[PDB]
Amino acid sequence: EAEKAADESERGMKVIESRAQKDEEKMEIQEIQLKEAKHIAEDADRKYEEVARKLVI
Amino acid sequence: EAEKAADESERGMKVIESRAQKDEEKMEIQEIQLKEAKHIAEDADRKYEEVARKLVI
Amino acid sequence: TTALVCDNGSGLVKAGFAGDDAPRAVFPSIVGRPRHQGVMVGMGQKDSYVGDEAQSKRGILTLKYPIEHGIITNWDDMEKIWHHTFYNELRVAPEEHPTLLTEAPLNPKANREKMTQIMFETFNVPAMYVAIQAVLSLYASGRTTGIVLDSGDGVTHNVPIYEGYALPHAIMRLDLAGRDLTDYLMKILTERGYSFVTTAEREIVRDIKEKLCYVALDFENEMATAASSSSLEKSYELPDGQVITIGNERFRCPETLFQPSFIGMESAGIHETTYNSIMKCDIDIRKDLYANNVLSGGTTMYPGIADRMQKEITALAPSTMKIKIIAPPERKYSVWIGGSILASLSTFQQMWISKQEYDEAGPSIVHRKCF
Amino acid sequence: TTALVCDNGSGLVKAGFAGDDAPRAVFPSIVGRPRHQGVMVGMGQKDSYVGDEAQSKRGILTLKYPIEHGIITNWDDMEKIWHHTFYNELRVAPEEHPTLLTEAPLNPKANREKMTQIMFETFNVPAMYVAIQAVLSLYASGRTTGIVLDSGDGVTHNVPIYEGYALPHAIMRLDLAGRDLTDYLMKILTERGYSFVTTAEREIVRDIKEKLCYVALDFENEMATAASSSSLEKSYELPDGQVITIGNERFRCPETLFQPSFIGMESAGIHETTYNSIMKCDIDIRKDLYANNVLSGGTTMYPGIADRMQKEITALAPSTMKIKIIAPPERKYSVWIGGSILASLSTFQQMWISKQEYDEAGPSIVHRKCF
Numbered sequence: 001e002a003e004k005a006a007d008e009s010e011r012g013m014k015v016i017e018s019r020a021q022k023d024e025e026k027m028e029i030q031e032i033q034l035k036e037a038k039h040i041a042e043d044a045d046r047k048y049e050e051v052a053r054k055l056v057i
Numbered sequence: 058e059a060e061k062a063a064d065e066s067e068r069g070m071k072v073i074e075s076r077a078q079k080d081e082e083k084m085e086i087q088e089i090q091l092k093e094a095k096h097i098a099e100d101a102d103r104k105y106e107e108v109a110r111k112l113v114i
Numbered sequence: 115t116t117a118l119v120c121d122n123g124s125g126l127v128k129a130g131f132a133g134d135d136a137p138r139a140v141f142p143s144i145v146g147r148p149r150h151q152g153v154m155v156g157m158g159q160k161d162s163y164v165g166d167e168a169q170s171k172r173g174i175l176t177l178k179y180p181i182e183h184g185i186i187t188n189w190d191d192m193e194k195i196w197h198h199t200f201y202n203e204l205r206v207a208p209e210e211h212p213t214l215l216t217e218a219p220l221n222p223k224a225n226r227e228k229m230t231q232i233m234f235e236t237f238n239v240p241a242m243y244v245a246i247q248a249v250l251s252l253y254a255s256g257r258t259t260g261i262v263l264d265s266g267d268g269v270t271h272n273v274p275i276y277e278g279y280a281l282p283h284a285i286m287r288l289d290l291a292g293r294d295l296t297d298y299l300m301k302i303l304t305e306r307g308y309s310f311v312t313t314a315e316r317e318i319v320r321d322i323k324e325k326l327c328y329v330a331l332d333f334e335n336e337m338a339t340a341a342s343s344s345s346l347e348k349s350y351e352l353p354d355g356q357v358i359t360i361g362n363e364r365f366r367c368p369e370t371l372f373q374p375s376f377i378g379m380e381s382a383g384i385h386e387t388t389y390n391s392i393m394k395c396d397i398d399i400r401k402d403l404y405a406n407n408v409l410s411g412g413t414t415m416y417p418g419i420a421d422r423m424q425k426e427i428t429a430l431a432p433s434t435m436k437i438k439i440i441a442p443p444e445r446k447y448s449v450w451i452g453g454s455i456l457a458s459l460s461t462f463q464q465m466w467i468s469k470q471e472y473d474e475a476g477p478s479i480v481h482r483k484c485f
Numbered sequence: 486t487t488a489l490v491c492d493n494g495s496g497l498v499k500a501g502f503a504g505d506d507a508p509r510a511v512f513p514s515i516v517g518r519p520r521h522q523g524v525m526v527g528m529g530q531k532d533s534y535v536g537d538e539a540q541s542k543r544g545i546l547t548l549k550y551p552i553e554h555g556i557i558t559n560w561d562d563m564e565k566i567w568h569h570t571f572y573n574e575l576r577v578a579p580e581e582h583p584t585l586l587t588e589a590p591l592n593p594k595a596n597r598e599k600m601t602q603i604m605f606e607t608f609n610v611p612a613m614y615v616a617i618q619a620v621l622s623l624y625a626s627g628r629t630t631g632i633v634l635d636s637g638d639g640v641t642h643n644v645p646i647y648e649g650y651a652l653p654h655a656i657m658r659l660d661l662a663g664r665d666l667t668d669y670l671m672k673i674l675t676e677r678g679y680s681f682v683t684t685a686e687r688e689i690v691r692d693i694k695e696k697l698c699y700v701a702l703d704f705e706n707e708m709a710t711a712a713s714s715s716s717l718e719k720s721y722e723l724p725d726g727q728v729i730t731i732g733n734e735r736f737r738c739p740e741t742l743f744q745p746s747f748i749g750m751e752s753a754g755i756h757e758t759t760y761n762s763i764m765k766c767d768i769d770i771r772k773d774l775y776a777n778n779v780l781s782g783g784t785t786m787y788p789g790i791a792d793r794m795q796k797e798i799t800a801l802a803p804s805t806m807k808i809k810i811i812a813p814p815e816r817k818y819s820v821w822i823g824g825s826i827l828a829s830l831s832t833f834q835q836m837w838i839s840k841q842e843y844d845e846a847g848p849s850i851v852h853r854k855c856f
């Protein structure tokens with residue numbers, strides 16, 4: 001009985017760990033995309049303010 | 058042997074569940090901030106285009 | 115067929131097919147051999163990572179630029195960089211495409227001759243042409259006159275042009291550029307405790323310089339303000355944590371451009387070598403050069419430089435002339451855009467150095483009529 | 486033919502043919518001569534029982550390990566152990582099988598040279614190769630980077646590796662390991678009345694340590710709890726009855742790993758020598774080493790160590806980096822599994838030290854290119 005319980009717990013542990021690792025990898029990719037979005041936002045903001053100042057002059 | 062295996066399996070399942078929930082929260086917040094940043098980027102690009110045209114005029 | 119507009123540069127190699135708006139592949143020009151021993155077997159470890167691959171494995175490499183100041187000091191590495199650029203970043207064999215390299219003014223002849231010899235013997239291109247990096251930047255602005263200050267990463271040169279007639283006696287080439295600013299920033303960061311020494315950490319200091327530094331409109335007022343308040347201290351997160359706070363190092367690094375005495379150079383800043391380059395020109399084209407001052411090159415992207423330079427020149431110049439500084443938003447790729455435009459012209463199609471011509475006169479053909 | 490992946494270790498010899506999942510024969514490395522007189526005639530009493538046979542007759546033997554701290558102090562006994570391992574536990578003559586020994590980092594040269602000389606002269610193997618015990622443990626995890634803390638029974642060493650390039654200047658070898666924990670447990674058990682002195686009773690104390698001790702997540706809270714309640718006191722039955730009750734000796738024995746001042750050692754715990762080993766590495770590979778910290782070796786099997794170590798390193802490390810501790814369930818045999826994988830590789834098949842090479846350069850061949 002104990003052997004059966006241990007094997008079932010082992011299988012559940014392995015599958016849940018695999019799914020967690022894959023979702024973690026995708027989360028890392030999402031963070032990379034967020035960083036790129038941050039950079040794009042900052043660059044565009046600088047563009048806009050510079051152009052507005054030049055237009056005023 | 059079975060007792061020790063069961064204890065280790067329980068601890069591993071606990072830690073994997075905690076890490077999985079952490080990953081889900083990180084994925085959610087990453088997606089939210091990503092969408093907000095993309096919308097801000099769209100707004101900035103539109104503003105840049107409009108002010109550039111006015112500047113040429 | 116289409117022409118390959120390569121642009122060696124010094125710090126970023128920019129390449130792409132003629133007739134587009136932006137270079138297809140832009141990647142740092144560094145070749146870094148591994149320096150540690152390596153214990154994993156069969157990992158597939160190469161002997162030299164070039165281009166953008168060595169900016170990701172830079173933790174265990176010793177990056178070394180193959181171009182010091184415009185000139186090329188390590189020909190094998192430069193050949194490796196060109197081979198990578200042709201085959202992996204563009205994936206077009208050079209046997210079927212003309213090439214248009216770019217070269218700084220006043221460079222040694224042997225550099226140019228070796229460049230053409232390599233392009234004709236190793237890569238075996240159909241025809242290649244070498245152009246001065248400032249005329250292209252003038253093409254991209256759509257002008258035909260103007261004095262262009264092309265402050266790259268290797269060397270800053272200032273070529274005045276009028277009505278299409280370049281003035282060879284008024285070119286003022288100065289060897290202060292982005293690399294010296296990186297070294298000076300790395301040297302003044304030590305005043306707060308942060309020590310960057312490794313050739314890999316020079317890249318981190320370069321990133322700090324790009325993201326934080328700006329050119330002050332008035333230097334003394336900024337030095338006084340940064341010494342009283344704390345509204346300038348901007349923080350930055352290293353590649354491992356331990357955020358750092360840059361104080362008045364922000365506008366002191368790029369100030370070296372206008373006061374080259376900071377890094378011990380004797381010459382005058384980029385604000386006064388432009389005025390000297392103008393004053394060497396004839397008395398009747400000085401108004402047009404004053405009104406059409408063009409900025410280009412990467413290092414002229416500092417926030418607030420187009421105002422400091424205009425203020426300085428207006429101080430130097432006579433009060434009646436109008437001083438205008440053209441600073442297009444696409445400054446970094448201005449030289450390459452101009453190169454694409456020049457390669458796309460029909461009138462230019464017969465100026466290439468055809469291979470049979472090289473076979474008849476040797477590599478010294480480049481100094482001849484086909485310039 | 487197949488290769489023999491032996492792994493001397495210190496405390497348990499693990500061996501087996503290359504290409505399997507687990508070592509074929511695992512048995513303590515002890516050689517014990519009888520110490521009493523012996524009156525029965527013709528009983529067939531041998532002069533030295535080695536391996537697992539001397540763990541059953543240990544009541545009348547004087548067991549003595551032939552490997553003290555990685556290094557080998559008694560070469561005759563080690564030769565006896567190897568002979569037993571080859572002939573009785575595997576039953577394969579060494580004349581027809583390559584061997585792959587393992588050795589701790591920073592060990593004396595003479596030990597390695599004598600090992601290869603024995604393997605080539607006495608057992609007369611076709612070819613043998615010596616590998617560092619941490620690279621194998623990194624193989625078994627299927628990684629290619631990461632900093633591995635291989636806390637064996639003899640010596641604890643901490644080898645950082647990046648992209649397959651080992652960093653020889655960042656290896657931190659510390660001589661606290663399972664044996665010192667056994668001695669310290671045997672020394673603190675005397676505070677309740679249980680005295681173990683004989684070299685045979687050291688095995689009983691080792692069994693107590695394996696079955697009962699655990700690493701506390703927070704030391705002071707556990708010390709306070711064990712001093713008020715009695716929920717920790719776990720009992721254990723000696724090999725003859727007279728059960729014993731271990732109180733707060735449970736988590737005080739393995740706490741010595743994180744505070745080596747308990748046994749009088751000066752150095753810092755295994756929680757801080759890992760951080761120091763990381764900080765000696767370059768600034769650009771610290772994130773990867775933080776994220777891929779690997780545990781191996783027997784002594785890292787204490788219940789609750791993978792959380793205490795992570796908490797400690799997270800306290801030391803910068804707040805932004807993610808700290809992850811890889812603790813595979815097959816920790817004990819991780820080095821041997823990695824050894825099997827390495828011996829099964831095709832790329833590795835030409836790195837063996839062939840016998841003709843040894844005949845030409847002597848035993849000092851091991852320090853040469855064939856490392």
Ligand SMILES: Nc1ncnc2c1ncn2[C@@H]1O[C@H](COP(=O)(O)OP(=O)(O)O)[C@@H](O)[C@H]1O
Pocket residue numbers: 122123124125126127265266267268292293296320323324325411412413415416446
């Ligand atoms: N956004 C920026 N802000 C400040 N400096 C920059 C920026 N982008 C690039 N630079 C500097 O300019 C250099 C790149 O110049 P570049 O025009 O590529 O030289 P080259 O003429 O060799 O192509 C970099 O080394 C960097 O120091």
Ligand SMILES: Nc1ncnc2c1ncn2[C@@H]1O[C@H](COP(=O)(O)OP(=O)(O)O)[C@@H](O)[C@H]1O
Pocket residue numbers: 493494495496497498636637638639663664667691694695696782783784786787817
């Ligand atoms: N399940 C366990 N719990 C706690 N400690 C253990 C356990 N198994 C082994 N050990 C300790 O580890 C030692 C065995 O370590 P091992 O990895 O065999 O050393 P080596 O590197 O020489 O092979 C034993 O002496 C014992 O003290």
Ligand SMILES: [Mg+2]
Pocket residue numbers: 123124247264266267411412449
């Ligand atoms: Mg340039």
Ligand SMILES: [Mg+2]
Pocket residue numbers: 494495618635637638782783820
């Ligand atoms: Mg070991």
